[PDB]
Amino acid sequence: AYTNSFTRGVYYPDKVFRSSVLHSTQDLFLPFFSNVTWFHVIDNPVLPFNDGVYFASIEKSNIIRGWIFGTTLDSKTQSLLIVNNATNVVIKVCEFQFCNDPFLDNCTFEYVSFKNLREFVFKNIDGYFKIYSKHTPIDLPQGFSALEPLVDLPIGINITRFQTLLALHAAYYVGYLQPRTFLLKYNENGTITDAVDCALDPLSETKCT
């Protein structure tokens, strides 16, 4: 299936404080009013990565627990793994495949840390994995939310495909990022309050000009 993006996916592009300005920057952004694939959980198909992934999830009890990343994903090359087991967050890059634990009655890197909508942006730039996130108490809602950076990792391995992980005893949306130019509005406190996609319609091109 498909559904509208509804002006979502705007994150902070850097670590620079700006106050009450309109800044035009070009980066990997989700295009406005675009198509995102909707999957329903009562399925976790293998999907590609491309230049980046906007992963939104509407949940009430955190059914989605994490993601797996890699190129082959068959215990052949390095495969990244994000797992939240409701106490801490585990990041691995090991090859070993583990079955999903039911919740009824060699690698050189490892890190240990409907009412809810959790939005994440994953992108791999010059061998660095960047994860931006935003969790809000709530098709996607037509509101503007700015995604703050949480996770930066020096991983290095290429990632071309990914797959989500479910807590098998809620729905999610997947979109792809594109190189786009955005006009962002920084208020008095350095928060991104609104954005304009410069290549959507001629009115926004006039606004960006």
């Binding site: 620079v16 404080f17 700006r18 350095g190």
Partner: peptide, 10 residues
Amino acid sequence: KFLPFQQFGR
């Protein structure tokens, strides 16, 4: 009033 993830002001 810097945000907690921000480092520089421009």
